[PDB]
Amino acid sequence: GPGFDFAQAIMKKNTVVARTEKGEFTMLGVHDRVAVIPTHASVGETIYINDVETKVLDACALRDLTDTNLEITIVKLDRNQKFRDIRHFLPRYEDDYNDAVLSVHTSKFPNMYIPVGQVTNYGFLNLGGTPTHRILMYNFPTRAGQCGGVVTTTGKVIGIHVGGNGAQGFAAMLLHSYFTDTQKHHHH
Amino acid sequence: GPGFDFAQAIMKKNTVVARTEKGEFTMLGVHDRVAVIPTHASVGETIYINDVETKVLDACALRDLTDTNLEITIVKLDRNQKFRDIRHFLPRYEDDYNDAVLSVHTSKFPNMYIPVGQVTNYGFLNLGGTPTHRILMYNFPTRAGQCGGVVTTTGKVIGIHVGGNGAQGFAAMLLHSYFTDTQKHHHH
Numbered sequence: 520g521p522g523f524d525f526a527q528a529i530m531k532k533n534t535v536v537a538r539t540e541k542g543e544f545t546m547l548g549v550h551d552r553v554a555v556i557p558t559h560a561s562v563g564e565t566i567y568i569n570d571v572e573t574k575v576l577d578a579c580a581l582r583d584l585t586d587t588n589l590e591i592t593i594v595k596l597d598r599n600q601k602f603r604d605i606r607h608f609l610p611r612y613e614d615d616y617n618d619a620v621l622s623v624h625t626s627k628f629p630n631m632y633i634p635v636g637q638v639t640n641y642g643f644l645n646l647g648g649t650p651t652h653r654i655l656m657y658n659f660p661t662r663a664g665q666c667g668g669v670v671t672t673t674g675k676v677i678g679i680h681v682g683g684n685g686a687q688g689f690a691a692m693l694l695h696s697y698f699t700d701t702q703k704h705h706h707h
Numbered sequence: 708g709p710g711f712d713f714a715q716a717i718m719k720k721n722t723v724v725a726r727t728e729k730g731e732f733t734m735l736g737v738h739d740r741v742a743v744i745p746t747h748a749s750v751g752e753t754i755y756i757n758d759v760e761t762k763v764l765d766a767c768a769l770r771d772l773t774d775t776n777l778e779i780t781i782v783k784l785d786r787n788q789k790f791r792d793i794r795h796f797l798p799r800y801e802d803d804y805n806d807a808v809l810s811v812h813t814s815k816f817p818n819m820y821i822p823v824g825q826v827t828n829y830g831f832l833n834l835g836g837t838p839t840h841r842i843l844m845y846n847f848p849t850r851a852g853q854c855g856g857v858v859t860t861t862g863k864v865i866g867i868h869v870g871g872n873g874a875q876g877f878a879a880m881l882l883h884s885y886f887t888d889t890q891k892h893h894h895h
Binding site: 520521523524527627628629630631632633634659660662 | 708709711712715815816817818819820821822847848850
């Protein structure tokens with residue numbers, strides 16, 4: 520069934536607890552000192568990472584070419600260790616998936632794994648009043664405190680949890696191309 | 708690492724959500740219509756099982772020969788399906804264990820898996836003011852709503868969660884001999 524061993528390896532080497540004015544979130548480190556967190560975390564210029572106050576060197580709230588929220592924020596942090604590079608486990612394209620795990624790492628739940636079954640490419644979602652694109656959906660109840668939970672299948676990190684109603688959960692897609700080294704562009 | 712596949716098989720075929728005046732508990736079905744739940748659930752003469760009201764035909768709050776609480780209650784239920792017989796997965800003796808999973812099944816968390824690392828035979832525990840014997844301990848924080856969570860290692864169901872402080876969790880041991888067909892004795 521589920522790739523529990525894979526989800527477990529991602530959680531140990533590549534997640535941290537992040538805390539902003541908005542609360543705590545599971546935060547996925549991706550490569551070097553680059554990580555992701557849901558845009559609703561409202562990242563500022565400092566953040567707590569495992570309860571250590573950390574300078575945010577860069578934060579990019581992703582939107583698509585329709586200027587619509589994608590609900591991922593890519594952050595660059597001022598800290599000493601690099602994350603293990605997990606870009607090769609990121610999907611190239613939008614897709615549907617079988618048998619996913621949602622894993623959570625917070626002060627409340629420091630390591631918890633939830634199979635969520637099939638994951639469908641859902642598309643548009645109205646996410647607490649913000650229109651949002653590129654959403655993945657799983658038919659599992661959602662509870663508070665799971666935001667940023669990392670959604671995996673064996674060998675693939677496919678997105679991060681961003682919301683739910685009492686019956687479904689929603690994750691924001693991760694694509695490999697969000698994290699390729701690139702072009703000289705004024706971003707702020 | 709952890710036997711996630713084993714814990715998952717136990718959860719699917721052998722647990723139900725039980726609800727008493729005291730709240731909800733993960734309930735482990737053991738064989739026929741016999742199950743266990745923590746003594747602190749305060750089982751009466753009817754109980755809800757997956758939100759269906761069910762007659763309790765028998766409840767035995769286990770104590771040892773020192774007349775001390777063991778915090779397991781064995782219940783016999785009036786319901787149509789039998790549980791898959793999992794007695795052969797019960798340990799013969801007290802023991803310590805490597806790499807356990809704690810799995811929870813409630814309306815809040817319908818399927819959640821938590822590795823808790825090493826499990827030690829701890830013995831005496833003062834459990835909210837009730838002295839209690841035969842306790843297993845794991846060095847993992849405890850959160851509310853996990854009572855009755857089933858503690859496994861691959862091929863062994865070793866106990867059920869009964870409490871914790873902010874740093875450790877405690878499970879009540881399950882032993883094979885709690886469930887062998889037996890002698891003619893007035894029990895009530």
